[PDB]
């Protein structure tokens, strides 16, 4: 009762996107990759249960899960879109996860590749002991 704590963790969301030398057969013009990770090789697996990348429904099997790092999806396509990313925590209490709406944009041929990084900070107030220890291993 006297004590309380706030645990903060840092996540990096991002993506790379490159106009391919030659479109694929379906007419996909770009390769891209999107990811969730911790800054500077930090291990978020300690508190992250899985990451679900919700690809546009134009993609087959759009809801892509990574239970283990690297938390990423690599794909080819023709258009940027908004890509909901759900990070689930190894948690036994609210919140069990957090959602980011990730802007997966493409630039046109002629422009250098996209290399985008978006930093996110999570704050957990008075996590359970179990979870607190997980967060603080990261």
């Amino acid at each position: 009762m006297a004590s309380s704590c706030a645990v903060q963790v840092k996540l990096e969301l991002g993506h790379r996107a490159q106009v391919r030398k030659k479109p694929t057969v379906e007419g996909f013009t770009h390769d891209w990759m999107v990811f969730v990770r911790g800054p500077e090789h930090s291990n978020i697996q300690h508190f992250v249960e899985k990451v679900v990348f919700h690809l546009h429904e134009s993609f087959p099997r759009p809801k892509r899960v990574c239970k283990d790092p690297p938390y990423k999806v690599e794909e080819s396509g023709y258009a940027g879109f908004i890509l909901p990313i759900e990070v689930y925590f190894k948690n036994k209490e609210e919140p069990r996860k957090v959602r980011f709406d990730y802007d997966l944009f493409l630039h046109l041929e002629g422009h250098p590749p996209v290399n985008h990084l978006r930093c996110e900070k999570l704050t957990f107030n008075n996590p359970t002991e179990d979870f607190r220890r997980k967060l603080l291993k990261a």
């Binding site: 790379r16 390769d31 990759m33 679900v52 099997r61 809801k63 892509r64 899960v65 990574c66 290399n115």
Partner: peptide, 13 residues
């Protein structure tokens, strides 16, 4: 939900 394939891809920028 879909696991992703383990097919390795060349790096790109």
């Amino acid at each position: 939900l879909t696991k992703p394939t383990l097919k390795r891809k060349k790096p790109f920028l």
